[PDB]
Amino acid sequence: HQPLIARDGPHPVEQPVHNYMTKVIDRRALNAAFSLATEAIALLTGEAL
Amino acid sequence: HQPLIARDGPHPVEQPVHNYMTKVIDRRALNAAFSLATEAIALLTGEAL
């Protein structure tokens, strides 16, 4: 909401303005890589025990 | 009212002085606009209620 300052003619009379605005969300991500190795699966599976 | 300082000859002899001005008022105005809208009139009026 914007204000006024009343002036005198012939400055045409001004009326209180208003502003209605909206915004749209924007989207991103992040990434990290955990990779294992073959035998380490056998040890955790228990197969190579 | 303006004052005197009494001098000597051969300087001429000055007299008391008095000054009267009267200023005229200067006039102006200001302006602001309230404007409404139609469907807003019907509400407050009680009509569309």
- Could you tell me if B35 lies within 8 Å of chain A, comparing CB atoms? yes
Angstrom distance (rounded) from CA A42 to CA A36: 11
Of B29, B33, B35, the CB nearest to A8: B29
Cα angle at A29 between A27 and A25, to 5 degrees? Answer: 15
Of B31, B34, B35, the CB nearest to A8: B31
Interface test mutation site (partner A, options B31, B34, B35, max chain A beta carbons within 10 A): B31
Angstrom distance (rounded) from CA B26 to CA B13: 41
Å resolution of this model? 3.8
> What technique was this entry resolved by?
cryo-EM
Angstrom distance (rounded) from CA A12 to CA B33: 10
- Residue B4 contacts residue B16 (beta carbons within 8 Å): yes
- Residue A7 contacts residue B33 (beta carbons within 8 Å): no
**What DSSP string describes A1-49?**
--------TTSPPP-----------------------HHHHHHHHTTT-
The number of residues in chain B equals 49
DSSP 8-state secondary structure symbol assigned to residue B17? B
